[PDB]
Design a protein around this ligand. Structure first.
Ligand SMILES: Cc1sc(NC(=O)C2=C(C(=O)O)CCCC2)c(-c2nc(C3CC3)no2)c1C
Length: 130
């Protein structure tokens, strides 16, 4: 849709702090910090696929809106994830061990803007079309 395409990370703010608040150890935060992933979003029928591709780590999720799914995150958390569409924003929550984090994906001008929240920490990542 508005989201479909191949997107390249161009800017990131507060990602290390976000990873820290998730309990991500130094080695994984080092891998993630200066990573510049591609994000490849596609849809077929009910099913949306979001692939994240980077030199040291790839991940992928496929989901139906509103339907919880199991996810292994890039930092090896086993989480229960639900993604919904709310006012044009893809809202993802991950729940594990009585905690939650939210990842919101929205389109703004030429940007795919990804807001990641854990407790008091807010990180913002911006992608543009590859
Ligand atoms: C090479 C890469 S990329 C990447 N994470 C992203 O790109 C992420 C997002 C996005 O921009 O889609 C949005 C949500 C957070 C993550 C990691 C990594 N995340 C984590 C914890 C924070 C989940 N630990 O490592 C690494 C090692």
């Amino acid at each position: 849709d508005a989201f479909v395409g191949t997107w390249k990370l161009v800017s990131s703010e507060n990602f290390d702090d976000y990873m820290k608040e998730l309990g991500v150890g130094f080695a994984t935060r080092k891998m993630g910090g200066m990573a510049k992933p591609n994000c490849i979003i596609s849809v077929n029928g009910d099913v949306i696929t979001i692939k994240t591709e980077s030199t040291l780590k790839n991940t992928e999720i496929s989901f139906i809106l509103g339907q919880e799914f199991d996810e292994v995150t890039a930092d090896d958390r086993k989480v229960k994830s639900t993604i919904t569409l709310d006012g044009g924003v893809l809202v993802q929550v991950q729940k594990w061990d009585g905690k939650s984090t939210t990842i919101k994906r929205k389109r703004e001008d030429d940007k795919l803007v990804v807001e990641c929240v854990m407790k008091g920490v807010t990180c913002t990542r911006v992608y543009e079309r590859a």
